[PDB]
Short mmCIF file of C-alpha atoms and ligand atoms in Angstrom, two decimals:
data_model
loop_
_atom_site.label_atom_id
_atom_site.label_comp_id
_atom_site.label_asym_id
_atom_site.label_seq_id
_atom_site.Cartn_x
_atom_site.Cartn_y
_atom_site.Cartn_z
CA UNK A 1 30.20 28.32 44.50
CA UNK A 2 33.11 30.15 41.89
CA UNK A 3 36.44 29.83 42.58
CA UNK A 4 37.89 32.57 43.26
CA UNK A 5 41.23 34.66 43.59
CA UNK A 6 43.13 37.33 45.84
CA UNK A 7 45.50 40.09 44.54
CA UNK A 8 46.65 43.22 46.63
CA UNK A 9 45.56 46.41 45.01
CA UNK A 10 46.93 49.75 46.27
CA UNK A 11 46.59 48.28 49.51
CA UNK A 12 43.27 46.00 49.77
CA UNK A 13 43.22 42.22 49.31
CA UNK A 14 40.69 41.65 46.53
CA UNK A 15 38.89 38.48 46.10
CA UNK A 16 37.26 37.79 43.01
CA UNK A 17 35.78 34.86 40.17
CA UNK A 18 38.01 33.61 38.32
CA UNK A 19 35.26 34.40 35.86
CA UNK A 20 36.86 38.39 36.99
CA UNK A 21 40.17 39.42 34.35
CA UNK A 22 42.61 41.09 34.77
CA UNK A 23 41.45 44.00 38.34
CA UNK A 24 42.83 47.40 37.18
CA UNK A 25 42.42 50.25 39.94
CA UNK A 26 40.25 53.00 38.42
CA UNK A 27 39.20 56.53 39.67
CA UNK A 28 42.20 57.36 41.56
CA UNK A 29 39.73 56.64 44.55
CA UNK A 30 36.57 58.89 42.76
CA UNK A 31 34.34 56.43 42.27
CA UNK A 32 35.89 54.64 45.14
CA UNK A 33 37.52 51.07 46.16
CA UNK A 34 37.00 50.39 42.27
CA UNK A 35 38.65 48.74 39.68
CA UNK A 36 37.71 48.03 35.93
CA UNK A 37 37.82 44.22 34.98
CA UNK A 38 37.53 41.69 32.35
CA UNK A 39 34.60 39.44 32.40
CA UNK A 40 35.70 36.26 30.38
CA UNK A 41 31.74 34.82 30.67
CA UNK A 42 30.75 37.46 28.32
CA UNK A 43 34.51 39.28 27.12
CA UNK A 44 32.43 42.71 27.93
CA UNK A 45 34.39 45.29 30.40
CA UNK A 46 33.44 45.72 33.97
CA UNK A 47 33.04 47.91 36.69
CA UNK A 48 33.52 45.90 40.30
CA UNK A 49 33.28 47.71 43.89
CA UNK A 50 34.62 46.36 46.64
CA UNK A 51 32.67 48.51 49.61
CA UNK A 52 34.33 50.24 52.11
CA UNK A 53 34.26 48.56 55.68
CA UNK A 54 30.20 47.42 54.99
CA UNK A 55 29.32 46.22 58.64
CA UNK A 56 31.63 48.57 60.35
CA UNK A 57 28.99 50.57 61.95
CA UNK A 58 24.78 50.85 61.84
CA UNK A 59 25.47 53.23 59.31
CA UNK A 60 27.78 51.37 56.56
CA UNK A 61 26.34 47.95 57.53
CA UNK A 62 22.28 50.60 56.42
CA UNK A 63 24.08 51.87 52.76
CA UNK A 64 25.36 49.27 52.41
CA UNK A 65 21.63 47.18 52.27
CA UNK A 66 20.33 49.96 50.82
CA UNK A 67 22.64 50.42 47.60
CA UNK A 68 22.48 46.44 47.32
CA UNK A 69 18.76 46.35 47.02
CA UNK A 70 18.83 50.04 45.04
CA UNK A 71 21.16 48.36 42.65
CA UNK A 72 19.32 45.38 42.49
CA UNK A 73 15.88 47.50 41.56
CA UNK A 74 17.36 49.53 39.07
CA UNK A 75 15.97 48.45 35.72
CA UNK A 76 16.50 51.38 33.03
CA UNK A 77 18.62 52.19 29.78
CA UNK A 78 18.57 55.22 31.64
CA UNK A 79 20.17 54.20 35.22
CA UNK A 80 23.50 51.64 36.14
CA UNK A 81 22.07 48.11 36.73
CA UNK A 82 23.99 45.70 38.41
CA UNK A 83 25.30 42.74 36.74
CA UNK A 84 26.72 41.18 39.72
CA UNK A 85 27.41 40.87 42.86
CA UNK A 86 29.34 38.58 45.13
CA UNK A 87 31.39 37.75 48.37
CA UNK A 88 33.83 35.34 49.27
CA UNK A 89 32.45 34.57 52.36
CA UNK A 90 31.05 30.66 52.12
CA UNK A 91 28.70 31.56 55.53
CA UNK A 92 27.14 34.64 57.20
CA UNK A 93 29.41 33.87 60.12
CA UNK A 94 32.33 34.57 57.98
CA UNK A 95 30.30 37.35 55.68
CA UNK A 96 32.26 40.31 56.20
CA UNK A 97 32.97 41.65 52.71
CA UNK A 98 30.72 43.03 49.83
CA UNK A 99 30.98 43.33 45.59
CA UNK A 100 29.50 44.69 43.15
CA UNK A 101 29.39 44.12 39.58
CA UNK A 102 28.60 46.96 36.85
CA UNK A 103 29.19 47.79 33.06
CA UNK A 104 32.56 49.34 32.79
CA UNK A 105 31.49 53.77 32.03
CA UNK A 106 33.70 55.03 29.89
CA UNK A 107 33.49 58.93 29.96
CA UNK A 108 31.62 61.46 32.05
CA UNK A 109 29.95 65.19 31.15
CA UNK A 110 32.94 66.25 31.38
CA UNK A 111 35.33 64.30 29.44
CA UNK A 112 32.61 65.43 26.76
CA UNK A 113 31.99 68.58 26.93
CA UNK A 114 36.24 69.19 27.93
CA UNK A 115 36.13 69.51 24.27
CA UNK A 116 33.97 71.46 21.48
CA UNK A 117 30.91 72.85 22.59
CA UNK A 118 28.30 70.22 22.05
CA UNK A 119 25.32 71.47 19.47
CA UNK A 120 21.60 71.52 20.06
CA UNK A 121 21.13 68.57 19.11
CA UNK A 122 23.34 66.96 20.64
CA UNK A 123 22.43 69.06 24.61
CA UNK A 124 18.31 67.56 23.59
CA UNK A 125 19.74 64.46 23.38
CA UNK A 126 21.78 64.62 26.54
CA UNK A 127 20.20 66.31 28.57
CA UNK A 128 16.44 64.12 27.81
CA UNK A 129 18.74 60.57 28.98
CA UNK A 130 18.80 62.64 32.30
CA UNK A 131 15.54 63.09 32.42
CA UNK A 132 14.47 60.03 30.96
CA UNK A 133 16.55 58.75 34.02
CA UNK A 134 14.88 60.60 36.34
CA UNK A 135 11.48 60.07 35.58
CA UNK A 136 12.45 56.24 36.38
CA UNK A 137 14.02 56.54 39.78
CA UNK A 138 11.86 59.48 40.74
CA UNK A 139 8.91 56.96 40.26
CA UNK A 140 10.19 54.42 42.88
CA UNK A 141 10.03 57.32 45.26
CA UNK A 142 14.14 57.76 44.84
CA UNK A 143 16.30 60.48 44.60
CA UNK A 144 19.68 60.93 43.64
CA UNK A 145 20.88 64.53 45.46
CA UNK A 146 23.65 64.62 43.67
CA UNK A 147 23.44 64.97 40.10
CA UNK A 148 26.41 66.31 38.11
CA UNK A 149 28.89 65.91 35.34
CA UNK A 150 30.65 63.27 37.10
CA UNK A 151 28.21 60.91 37.99
CA UNK A 152 26.98 61.22 34.72
CA UNK A 153 28.35 58.15 31.91
CA UNK A 154 27.73 58.28 28.51
CA UNK A 155 29.25 55.88 25.23
CA UNK A 156 29.98 55.91 21.62
CA UNK A 157 26.67 56.60 20.88
CA UNK A 158 26.15 59.37 23.83
CA UNK A 159 23.93 57.00 24.92
CA UNK A 160 23.80 58.68 29.44
CA UNK A 161 23.40 56.31 32.24
CA UNK A 162 23.15 58.16 36.22
CA UNK A 163 25.66 56.84 38.15
CA UNK A 164 26.74 57.77 41.80
CA UNK A 165 29.42 57.63 43.59
CA UNK A 166 28.63 57.83 47.05
CA UNK A 179 33.09 69.03 39.96
CA UNK A 180 32.23 70.51 43.21
CA UNK A 181 28.59 68.04 43.89
CA UNK A 182 27.03 72.41 45.42
CA UNK A 183 27.32 73.76 41.93
CA UNK A 184 24.76 71.59 41.41
CA UNK A 185 22.75 71.43 44.35
CA UNK A 186 19.85 72.74 44.53
CA UNK A 187 19.50 76.11 46.87
CA UNK A 188 17.11 74.65 49.37
CA UNK A 189 19.66 72.06 50.67
CA UNK A 190 21.75 74.12 51.08
CA UNK A 191 20.15 76.30 53.54
CA UNK A 192 18.77 73.05 55.52
CA UNK A 193 15.76 74.11 55.05
CA UNK A 194 14.32 70.05 55.05
CA UNK A 195 11.89 69.06 53.64
CA UNK A 196 13.15 68.38 49.87
CA UNK A 197 11.55 67.98 47.00
CA UNK A 198 12.80 65.20 43.73
CA UNK A 199 12.47 68.01 42.35
CA UNK A 200 16.07 68.64 43.85
CA UNK A 201 17.25 66.61 41.22
CA UNK A 202 15.87 68.45 38.58
CA UNK A 203 17.42 72.08 39.85
CA UNK A 204 20.73 70.02 39.63
CA UNK A 205 19.51 68.89 35.91
CA UNK A 206 18.86 72.98 34.92
CA UNK A 207 22.66 73.88 36.28
CA UNK A 208 23.72 70.78 34.18
CA UNK A 209 21.89 71.68 30.94
CA UNK A 210 23.05 75.68 31.01
CA UNK A 211 26.85 74.45 31.43
CA UNK A 212 26.49 72.00 28.15
CA UNK A 213 24.87 74.95 26.34
CA UNK A 214 27.81 78.12 27.59
CA UNK A 215 30.59 75.65 28.16
CA UNK A 216 30.66 77.45 32.10
CA UNK A 217 29.81 76.35 35.44
CA UNK A 218 26.31 79.00 36.06
CA UNK A 219 26.83 78.38 39.82
CA UNK A 220 30.33 77.98 40.26
CA UNK A 221 30.73 79.08 44.28
CA UNK A 222 33.44 78.92 46.39
CA UNK A 223 31.31 78.09 49.37
CA UNK A 224 27.90 77.06 50.17
CA UNK A 225 27.31 81.45 51.51
CA UNK A 226 28.93 82.30 48.00
CA UNK A 227 27.56 79.90 45.68
CA UNK A 228 23.61 80.87 47.61
CA UNK A 229 24.61 84.34 46.74
CA UNK A 230 25.18 83.76 42.80
CA UNK A 231 21.17 81.47 42.67
CA UNK A 232 19.35 84.19 44.35
CA UNK A 233 21.02 87.13 41.85
CA UNK A 234 20.10 85.30 39.50
CA UNK A 235 16.70 83.47 40.13
CA UNK A 236 15.85 86.28 42.32
CA UNK A 237 14.53 87.01 45.67
CA UNK A 238 11.86 84.65 47.11
CA UNK A 239 9.01 86.40 45.83
CA UNK A 240 6.26 86.67 49.49
CA UNK A 241 4.26 83.46 47.40
CA UNK A 242 7.47 81.46 48.82
CA UNK A 243 8.04 83.61 51.93
CA UNK A 244 4.73 82.09 53.02
CA UNK A 245 6.22 78.52 52.98
CA UNK A 246 8.66 79.04 55.05
CA UNK A 247 8.30 77.96 58.83
CA UNK A 248 11.48 78.94 60.92
CA UNK A 249 11.23 83.40 61.31
CA UNK A 250 15.45 83.65 60.68
CA UNK A 251 15.22 81.24 57.98
CA UNK A 252 12.84 83.62 56.18
CA UNK A 253 15.42 86.89 56.91
CA UNK A 254 18.79 84.85 56.17
CA UNK A 255 17.13 83.26 52.64
CA UNK A 256 16.88 87.45 52.12
CA UNK A 257 20.01 88.55 53.10
CA UNK A 258 20.80 86.55 50.61
CA UNK A 259 19.56 87.62 47.75
CA UNK A 260 20.94 91.46 48.61
CA UNK A 261 23.17 91.47 45.06
CA UNK A 262 22.79 92.84 42.15
CA UNK A 263 19.67 91.01 40.39
CA UNK A 264 20.87 89.74 36.66
CA UNK A 265 18.29 88.70 34.20
CA UNK A 266 18.45 84.82 33.12
CA UNK A 267 18.51 86.04 29.08
CA UNK A 268 21.94 87.43 29.21
CA UNK A 269 23.58 84.25 30.71
CA UNK A 270 22.41 82.42 28.11
CA UNK A 271 22.45 84.25 24.78
CA UNK A 272 22.43 82.62 21.38
CA UNK A 273 20.65 79.52 23.06
CA UNK A 274 18.53 78.10 20.93
CA UNK A 275 14.68 79.78 22.70
CA UNK A 276 13.21 76.50 23.60
CA UNK A 277 15.81 75.94 25.63
CA UNK A 278 16.03 78.67 27.74
CA UNK A 279 12.15 78.26 28.40
CA UNK A 280 12.67 74.98 30.25
CA UNK A 281 15.40 76.80 32.04
CA UNK A 282 13.33 79.03 33.56
CA UNK A 283 11.28 76.06 34.45
CA UNK A 284 14.22 73.85 35.84
CA UNK A 285 15.79 76.82 37.89
CA UNK A 286 12.89 77.98 40.17
CA UNK A 287 13.76 78.68 43.35
CA UNK A 288 10.77 77.49 44.80
CA UNK A 289 10.69 73.97 44.41
CA UNK A 290 6.53 73.40 44.39
CA UNK A 291 6.73 74.98 40.74
CA UNK A 292 9.85 73.42 39.46
CA UNK A 293 8.97 71.45 36.74
CA UNK A 294 9.19 67.47 36.82
CA UNK A 295 11.19 65.40 35.45
CA UNK A 296 7.70 63.87 34.02
CA UNK A 297 7.10 67.01 32.44
CA UNK A 298 10.60 68.37 31.54
CA UNK A 299 10.22 65.15 29.12
CA UNK A 300 6.97 66.70 26.89
CA UNK A 301 8.13 70.05 27.09
CA UNK A 302 8.90 70.67 23.50
CA UNK A 303 12.40 71.27 23.35
CA UNK A 304 12.72 67.69 23.51
CA UNK A 305 10.30 67.06 20.90
CA UNK A 306 12.28 64.96 18.23
CA UNK A 307 13.33 62.33 21.04
CA UNK A 308 9.55 62.72 23.13
CA UNK A 309 7.89 59.43 23.54
CA UNK A 310 5.81 58.63 26.27
CA UNK A 311 5.49 54.74 25.56
CA UNK A 312 9.31 54.76 25.60
CA UNK A 313 10.03 56.47 28.83
CA UNK A 314 9.06 53.40 31.29
CA UNK A 315 8.78 53.90 34.89
CA UNK A 316 10.35 51.36 37.69
CA UNK A 317 7.86 48.52 39.97
CA UNK A 318 7.17 49.65 43.42
CA UNK A 319 10.44 49.48 45.14
CA UNK A 320 9.95 47.96 48.94
CA UNK A 321 12.01 50.82 51.13
CA UNK A 322 10.33 49.96 54.49
CA UNK A 323 13.75 49.15 55.42
CA UNK A 324 14.57 52.64 55.38
CA UNK A 325 11.92 53.40 58.88
CA UNK A 326 13.87 50.86 60.61
CA UNK A 327 16.78 51.33 62.94
CA UNK A 328 18.84 47.67 63.76
CA UNK A 329 21.86 45.33 64.69
CA UNK A 330 24.82 45.61 61.99
CA UNK A 331 24.69 41.61 62.35
CA UNK A 332 20.41 42.72 61.22
CA UNK A 333 21.24 44.28 58.37
CA UNK A 334 24.12 42.42 58.11
CA UNK A 335 22.05 39.24 57.67
CA UNK A 336 19.68 41.70 55.03
CA UNK A 337 22.23 42.15 52.72
CA UNK A 338 23.60 38.67 53.09
CA UNK A 339 20.15 37.88 51.88
CA UNK A 340 19.85 39.82 49.42
CA UNK A 341 23.96 38.71 47.51
CA UNK A 342 21.98 34.96 47.39
CA UNK A 343 18.95 35.64 46.16
CA UNK A 344 20.60 37.50 42.71
CA UNK A 345 19.38 36.25 40.27
CA UNK A 346 21.92 38.11 36.80
CA UNK A 347 19.86 39.80 34.32
CA UNK A 348 19.61 37.47 30.61
C1 337 B 401 27.28 54.36 45.90
O1 337 B 401 25.36 53.80 45.90
C2 337 B 401 24.87 54.54 44.53
C3 337 B 401 24.85 53.86 42.93
N1 337 B 401 25.19 53.33 43.23
C4 337 B 401 26.74 53.43 41.64
O2 337 B 401 25.93 54.40 40.85
C5 337 B 401 27.37 52.40 41.48
C6 337 B 401 27.68 50.79 42.20
C7 337 B 401 28.26 49.82 42.16
C8 337 B 401 29.06 50.45 40.32
C9 337 B 401 29.96 49.58 41.38
C10 337 B 401 29.64 51.76 40.07
N2 337 B 401 29.90 51.99 40.04
C11 337 B 401 30.95 52.19 38.33
C12 337 B 401 31.75 52.78 37.76
C13 337 B 401 32.04 53.18 36.47
O3 337 B 401 31.97 52.26 35.52
N3 337 B 401 33.21 53.68 36.72
C14 337 B 401 34.13 54.44 35.45
C15 337 B 401 33.63 55.83 35.42
C16 337 B 401 32.22 55.68 35.28
C17 337 B 401 31.91 57.39 35.51
C18 337 B 401 32.74 58.17 33.96
C19 337 B 401 33.86 57.36 33.24
C20 337 B 401 33.95 55.70 33.78
N4 337 B 401 32.67 53.34 38.76
N5 337 B 401 32.01 53.04 40.11
C21 337 B 401 28.41 52.42 40.44
C22 337 B 401 23.69 54.22 42.36
C23 337 B 401 22.47 55.32 42.87
C24 337 B 401 21.74 55.49 41.63
C25 337 B 401 22.11 56.62 41.26
C26 337 B 401 20.67 54.65 41.31
C27 337 B 401 20.52 56.50 42.35
C28 337 B 401 22.42 55.45 44.03
C29 337 B 401 23.52 54.66 45.38
N6 337 B 401 23.76 56.22 46.62
S1 337 B 401 22.80 54.47 47.82
C30 337 B 401 22.08 53.23 47.11
O4 337 B 401 22.66 55.48 48.47
O5 337 B 401 23.63 54.43 48.30
#
């Protein structure tokens, strides 16, 4: 067991292995209880996250376990990975805190775009990586659900990583989620990618809504009123009428919005920003799209190992979730 040392950052007490030095708060709370630190074992800067109140409730307990399990499984170039996980507790009895360690990301997508308009090559590479990482997460039967510029990190060589901190999320949210259609599929993430890719090509938020309703009306105005085909798949009658009553604004054509952009990029955009999620292109298919020809490689776009998510359909007591979490902490083996 490493030797720990404690300190108070802001108003919280951090107790971490000596290995991690010079802890410094970051994200102004945007990442949560996160600190940047120097991993003395490798000389590399890392992000140390102290889970809030891990076991204060059953909901917290399960989310704690969920994140620990997910991070331990995520082994992909375009997805955040778990470098270390620890607790100052010496036993299950005193186990009350969990810290997750990951590489420290450099800058999000906003910081990179806030400069000058990225070239088409730049856009291809970035979107390609998001799509590459998405293929991997989706292959593990996992849905991000909150993709956005602030959740996407890019390094020196423009390498990108998908993260989550648990730009308004709504601007990139698929319409079916904001309509509470309950039956969301993975492509809800593809809608977000389209909104992100659009913003990188125009420098402006595609659907900058004030509230969800306004946001919804903006979306329908661009992707159009729901067609007969989509309407017949909506069981709720009030839902069916509502979605139509929200598409009363004067229509807008797609092409106009992306004028000047590479025709291939607009083609992909039209296949990502489709109202009917069933007809929305998947991450896997997007990767083969001609817009990513200079980057696509069927041999270097890996999927995830089978991921056991049986715990999601479980309803257990806090202590049970805590014990399960503790087990995952002790069984953690760092990657080479
Ligand atoms: C919230 O839980 C997660 C996570 N956890 C994380 O992404 C995570 C874990 C630990 C740490 C220390 C961090 N982390 C790294 C940084 C960082 O480098 N910030 C600086 C910086 C940052 C950006 C730009 C510039 C500078 N901050 N926090 C992230 C991931 C995921 C996916 C992406 C795999 C689907 C889902 C959930 N959802 S769930 C399990 O259902 O709960």
